Design an enzyme around this catalytic site. Sequence first.
Site, PDB file in Angstrom:
ATOM      1  N   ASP A   1       0.751  -1.432   0.033  1.00 18.49           N
ATOM      2  CA  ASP A   1       0.088   0.071   0.007  1.00 18.49           C
ATOM      3  C   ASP A   1       0.929   1.294   0.232  1.00 18.49           C
ATOM      4  O   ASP A   1       2.167   1.088  -0.116  1.00 18.49           O
ATOM      5  CB  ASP A   1      -0.937  -0.020   0.923  1.00 18.49           C
ATOM      6  CG  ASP A   1      -0.492  -0.071   2.334  1.00 18.49           C
ATOM      7  OD1 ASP A   1       0.804   0.471   2.497  1.00 18.49           O
ATOM      8  OD2 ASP A   1      -1.018  -0.531   3.669  1.00 18.49           O
TER       9      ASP A   1
ATOM     10  N   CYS B   1       4.368   2.201   2.369  1.00 16.41           N
ATOM     11  CA  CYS B   1       5.501   1.332   2.290  1.00 16.41           C
ATOM     12  C   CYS B   1       6.707   1.958   2.641  1.00 16.41           C
ATOM     13  O   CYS B   1       7.555   1.182   3.125  1.00 16.41           O
ATOM     14  CB  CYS B   1       5.352   0.428   0.921  1.00 16.41           C
ATOM     15  SG  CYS B   1       5.581   1.772  -0.503  1.00 16.41           S
TER      16      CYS B   1
ATOM     17  N   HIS C   1       6.904   0.958  -5.001  1.00 14.25           N
ATOM     18  CA  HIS C   1       6.749  -0.011  -3.758  1.00 14.25           C
ATOM     19  C   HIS C   1       8.336  -0.336  -3.236  1.00 14.25           C
ATOM     20  O   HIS C   1       9.321  -0.476  -3.864  1.00 14.25           O
ATOM     21  CB  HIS C   1       6.016  -1.081  -4.013  1.00 14.25           C
ATOM     22  CG  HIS C   1       6.167  -1.956  -2.830  1.00 14.25           C
ATOM     23  ND1 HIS C   1       5.409  -1.972  -1.973  1.00 14.25           N
ATOM     24  CD2 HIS C   1       7.104  -3.142  -2.191  1.00 14.25           C
ATOM     25  CE1 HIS C   1       5.521  -2.985  -0.872  1.00 14.25           C
ATOM     26  NE2 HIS C   1       6.836  -3.517  -1.190  1.00 14.25           N
TER      27      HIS C   1
END
Lengths: 141, 141
Positions: free
Chosen positions: B24, B27, B133
């Site tokens: 999400d 991160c 991410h």
Amino acid sequence: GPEFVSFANQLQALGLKLREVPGDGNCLFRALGDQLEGHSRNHLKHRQETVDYMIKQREDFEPFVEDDIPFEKHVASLAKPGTFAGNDAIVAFARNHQLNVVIHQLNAPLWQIRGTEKSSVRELHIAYRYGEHYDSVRRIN
Amino acid sequence: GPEFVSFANQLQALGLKLREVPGDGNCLFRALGDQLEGHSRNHLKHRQETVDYMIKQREDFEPFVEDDIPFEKHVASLAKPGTFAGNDAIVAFARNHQLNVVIHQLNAPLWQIRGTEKSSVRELHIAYRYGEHYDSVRRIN
């Protein structure tokens, strides 16, 4: 992207440091020897054994040779102490010893030359630098 | 050059491994928290403290904002839990905590975001991956 300012800093971030070998054509075999055995004193033997392996596995190594240069000329030159060695020598050494060679370079992607098809083998670390020079890369602590 | 076949292999060669955080928008702060404190449970606090620092040092951080987007809009969005954070957040966190952040990426040069002008400071390791991410990168043994 955001680069390291020195190669020393880059290795240090990974808990590694350079062990320099002299600036001559024997550098790759000295660096590989240092990794394999903890010292570079057998660099002549490693050069000879590497050439022997290349000859034994000629069909595998002829593809590495820059065209119009006979395979015999390539390996004969490589057999001479002081002749700078390249990637094909790393491949040969790695396959002969059934291990991997990880190559560090300042602000360049980490490379890995795999000597086997296996999953868990011994891993040696060297550093590529200016010209055709290689050093050994060792743990700090 | 000769690339690693997986990111796991690349880190393993360096004696490192991934500690994944959820996929999400939190991160980066979870990964940085994990590095700083050994766990990611303070990720909301790190997000808020990072935004606070960016505001306090606005003149330093406005240059990072993609043009025609007001600085206020950028930091207001970043303040919301779940908003994906970028490089400017890493710079802010690193400067706020006076440390460095080393960023790993599969088959890409290792990056270093330096939070100080100093020579010997604490160093945190994260991994950048698909999309926006980030994961934590820890020692194996």
